[PDB]
Amino acid sequence: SMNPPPPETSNPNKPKRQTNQLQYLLRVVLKTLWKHQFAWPFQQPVDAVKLNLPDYYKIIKTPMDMGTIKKRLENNYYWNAQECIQDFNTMFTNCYIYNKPGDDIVLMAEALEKLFLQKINELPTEE
């Protein structure tokens, strides 16, 4: 089958902004999760062909991955922290929807989500 095009990371028609919360999401949250030994399956869009994940894009219609989030933060794509947090939550939810409970990738996502929630607990107030 074919993969879909990846999510956009910049759009010249969408307003762009940098806030200190978004800078924390890039410099602290994303960086912490990215280096985690479990992060690699989440660093790029699912290539369903090459991963032989059957029906991935029949089931997952809102794909999201940390590479996309990283590029969106780097391009000031998000207007607020809620939009960025939603993308992390979509990434985790997709993994929990497509995969069987107790699969290794689910346990990996749960570990990353636990760390994510730890880092978001200390999100700074807006400056």
Ligand SMILES: CCn1cnc2c1c(=O)[nH]c(=O)n2C[C@H]1CC[C@H](CNS(=O)(=O)c2ccc(OC3CCOCC3)c(F)c2)CC1
């Ligand atoms: C997220 C999108 N995506 C990308 N690849 C995807 C998916 C998707 O949604 N479902 C998919 O199936 N895949 C393929 C898999 C293939 C296997 C790969 C893990 N292999 S591993 O790094 O060698 C490894 C790590 C940790 C292990 O054990 C610990 C023990 C306690 O806690 C955590 C587990 C372990 F035994 C083996 C994980 C992706």
